Amino acid sequence: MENFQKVEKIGEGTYGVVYKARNKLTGEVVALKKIRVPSTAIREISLLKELNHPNIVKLLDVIHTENKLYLVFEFLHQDLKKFMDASALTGIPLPLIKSYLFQLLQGLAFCHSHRVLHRDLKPQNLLINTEGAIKLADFGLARAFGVPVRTEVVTLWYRAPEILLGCKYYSTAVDIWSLGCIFAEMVTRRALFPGDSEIDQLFRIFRTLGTPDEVVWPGVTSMPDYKPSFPKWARQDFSKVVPPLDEDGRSLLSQMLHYDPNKRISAKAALAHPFFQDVTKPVPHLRL
């Protein structure tokens, strides 16, 4: 760490305080994340150093000294939550929503092809630049360090239903669910399922997509946290959930929101959906 000068505190992340810093020898500007150390974790992280893709924030190095751990990442100038908030009066234009989704799907397809999951996608770990790129931050850190209840409260808004129902061996499909919620959020300017507890989260899902049963999700009634006493709500039309969105968009979103994780659309198949027939790469208006 003597090799870096901290420029400012960017914020609080899932695992610790995140700083903007400058490397004293190379001059590189980076994001430095303090992790608040078991062998297993160091090995896992170490493997993420080779999982390189243009839509994945680059892990530059891992620093482990005096039993403290710092991850050095590529620095981008803003996250999607701040971009959304700044764009609130008028919304992010559809072609840019579309471009970001496509690129995020490319990111996911890459990691998922190597069996690595994110597990904790949320606007705050989606980072953008001035060229129109968007990239996924903290990929793989969940399985390396776990996902805690508090850091700040950890948000449940983007969590897939299988996780909430206590499935122990969930799959890459959880990341597709998350991205779908984020897609809907971009389009409506409002979080799709803003739960404030685990049951509140589930019931928000059920209130919009219908309470899941054996017809839509074989095996669901056997999941560890499923209760027969869950209220049974009817599903709503996607026309009411994300109105602005045209039918291609609504079709894709519904496939990314399938209850059954084995039928939920994959990132690779999502990339082939007709929604992306006319995709382009616009540049955002960013005030840095």
Ligand SMILES: Nc1nc(OC[C@H]2CCC(=O)N2)c2nc[nH]c2n1
């Ligand atoms: N600019 C920036 N910011 C980061 O974290 C931003 C998230 C953390 C908590 C928050 O509020 N936003 C990064 N992570 C890797 N590279 C980064 N570059």
